[PDB]
Design a protein around this nucleic acid. Sequence first.
RNA 1: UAGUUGGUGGGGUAAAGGCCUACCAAGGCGACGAUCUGUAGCGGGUCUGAGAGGAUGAUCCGCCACACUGGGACUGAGACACGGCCCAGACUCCUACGGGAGGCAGCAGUGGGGAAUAUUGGACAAUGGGGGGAACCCUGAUCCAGCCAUGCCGCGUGUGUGA
RNA 2: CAGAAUAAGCACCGGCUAACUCUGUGCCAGCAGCCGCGGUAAUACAGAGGGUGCGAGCGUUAAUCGGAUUUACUGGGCGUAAAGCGUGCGUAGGCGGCUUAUUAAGUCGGAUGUGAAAUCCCCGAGCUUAACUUGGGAAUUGCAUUCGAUACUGGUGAGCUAGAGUAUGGGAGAGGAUGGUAGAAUUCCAGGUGUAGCGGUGAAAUGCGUAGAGAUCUGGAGGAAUACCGAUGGCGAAGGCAGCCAUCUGGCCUAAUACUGACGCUGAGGUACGAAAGCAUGGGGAGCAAACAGGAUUAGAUACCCUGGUAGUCCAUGCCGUAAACGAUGUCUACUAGCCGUUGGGGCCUUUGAGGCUUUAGUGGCGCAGCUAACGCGAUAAGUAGACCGCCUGGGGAGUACGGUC
RNA 3: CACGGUGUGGCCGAUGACUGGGGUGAAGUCGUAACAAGGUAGCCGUAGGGGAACCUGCGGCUGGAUC
Lengths: 130, 122
Amino acid sequence: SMQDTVADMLTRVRNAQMAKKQTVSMPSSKLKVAIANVLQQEGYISNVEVAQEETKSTLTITLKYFEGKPVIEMVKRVSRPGLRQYRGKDKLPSVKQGLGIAIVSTSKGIMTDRAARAAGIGGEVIAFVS
Amino acid sequence: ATTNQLIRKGRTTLVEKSKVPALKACPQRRGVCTRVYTTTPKKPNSAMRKVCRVRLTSGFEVSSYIGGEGHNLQEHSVVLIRGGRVKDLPGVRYHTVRGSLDCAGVKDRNQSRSKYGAKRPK
RNA sequence: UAGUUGGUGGGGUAAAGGCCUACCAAGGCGACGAUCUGUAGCGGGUCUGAGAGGAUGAUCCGCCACACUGGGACUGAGACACGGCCCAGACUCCUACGGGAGGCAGCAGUGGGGAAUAUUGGACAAUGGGGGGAACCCUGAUCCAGCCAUGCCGCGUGUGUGA
RNA sequence: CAGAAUAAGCACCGGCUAACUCUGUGCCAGCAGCCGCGGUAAUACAGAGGGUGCGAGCGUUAAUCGGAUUUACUGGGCGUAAAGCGUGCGUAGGCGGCUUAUUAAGUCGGAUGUGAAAUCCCCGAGCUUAACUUGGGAAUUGCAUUCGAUACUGGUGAGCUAGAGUAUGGGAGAGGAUGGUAGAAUUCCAGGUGUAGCGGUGAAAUGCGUAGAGAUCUGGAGGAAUACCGAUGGCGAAGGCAGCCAUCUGGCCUAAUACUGACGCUGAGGUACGAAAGCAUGGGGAGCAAACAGGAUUAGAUACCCUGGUAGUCCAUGCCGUAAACGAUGUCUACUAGCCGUUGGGGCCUUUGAGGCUUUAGUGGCGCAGCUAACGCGAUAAGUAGACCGCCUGGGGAGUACGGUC
RNA sequence: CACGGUGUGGCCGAUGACUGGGGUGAAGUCGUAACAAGGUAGCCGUAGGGGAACCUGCGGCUGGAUC
């Protein structure tokens, strides 16, 4: 059965980018919306939309291509249900020597490793994006 | 393996055996010469190579090569043995130290004298 | 696992406590490894490795345990006491055969084992320890000396000219 | 003060690895860490000349880590190289859908106490320098108490329906168990017709037959298996399941409403099923056929070929628990170009009945991207990801010995 | 209660006339099982037989050539 919805969302985005689609849709959740918002703010994707029929919620993401290659060249799930990963404020991972972003869930919300170091807090490491 | 599998059973290391068991982790051993003789090399080598079966203070009986040309060893001599295989002779894993206890240094030798235990000529 | 797990009365200790004892009850531990069995002194540290790790526990410091092999207690603030006592065991020594004696895993040293590891030295002048009012006495701790290329560091074994 | 006066060795020179020639010996003597040298021109053996590297030292042996991503947490694998249990069910455990309120166990932050000295590192100081000694820092990545944060995980309360399941209509099937029954053929038996061969092989022979075969016709007995349909078809967890009929019975597909409301996935131990051969007790026995007997072939034949033939193959009740039990590919979930077939359903369209589009669950052939050592795989993944389990660590010895369970 | 004694039963180690298999070496002897359709396709499980590689029966696989 399906036991990692965040990993499912990242896999959907990766496969859509590799197949060169324009948009990708999935069942929605607040955590997924929060991660997509960070991606859009950092500029890896264009638009994030949420629709509600009666109780089902659909999340739609518009993808970006620059030159011929996709903008997201690498997206990796770090924390997984079989192994949770927690880091202190001084051991936050850096992705591609600062050219990529690590998504971190802290007690002040979801942000990047840069903002987490600026605020001086740690948390859970969700994914690496570059 | 999965994380749960590793937690339930960790990685296992296989121990290593020494190639010179008769020394018992000592640099050299002392033995009494039980049988001096000559043997023939494995193919594709042909010669007559001098070896001796020796009983050591460790409680073992092994075979040891005799290096150099010309030796004075015989029955019941007391010798010192070190490690080192002869390769083309199967089963000979040790060497005899030249000029240590009853073995004497080789004669008429002027290069590589510290091996074979020959003193400086006058 | 049957003083075993808990409780009550009593005893015992410097002190809590099945520590001991008489009853009452049937509990206690175990796949998060009980019981049995092999091996092993533990740590600060040391070697290696980019790191994570792996191997290790000489010399220096802290803790523990032991003192020919087992079982006890006495004295004392403090010991179940290396150079104190009692008992049992093995071993060794003196003897006039009546009777006695001993424990280097303290320093030096001997035999043996081993590939392999040193002198049967000097002084309490210094730092400490014991006794004493002091003078002072004791101290193989210690401070020094002897032997070994075992290691690390440094120096020399000559310089210029001379076809 | 005296006067160069008292004071240099060890290893190596085919490659890995800086440094080459000549004499002596001829698979001998010998060298050797690995690969390998020496069997008349040895840059590899011994000596000499020369040189290279170190230097009061130089070499060998022993031991630990490294190189070794060669136990892979960082950081490996299982189609064919070693490696997916024969297949299910299920206990402990691991993991687990969406929304909301609360808690502060995990997680994060601050403060305080502690983390002996020596050791490691940094800046200095004293030794003629250096080793060495030493001042002050930094560090000791840890632990405990206490005060805070609430995004994620966990706990508790409430709510939801996309997962999972239930009721009602319909459909396909060699799914299973029991009992009946039909036709073809083989063997044997009885009886007609009939008379010298039949049978078998590469060629023969053993064998059958004049007390009459073989061939042909009629009737009877018995056992085992189900031609055509038949199919890259179907059903089953796997092993497997084919004539027809009745009885008992499991699962699957398909439509729409209704209902419960996470009831789920995997699964160490455990347990159930599990081809063929084999074993036990009692039956049955047509054909076939291990063992065995004879005839051939051959240098020999123990075999292949031929003539016979007993266990067994069949039934009832039990055991055994193994196969190249194979897709050599564990189970579950989501996503990612297309083209051509076929089986069981649903829907739409013509327009009269046969076709054409879709959708779903199976079963096949190609093939883009991607993956792979290559072969190849490619929506039935060996692609992209997640959860849990099983297994591998050079070839032999060896799925072996000992111990134990059955 | 230590040491000791008796009886009985475990476990570890050493040792033993004789016997069974394994490996290495040298190719002395008998064959030719496998590799090509290896001259009877090969291999897996099981059973029987044989100086020996092996042969035969039943079931299974293609990791079988030609059609």
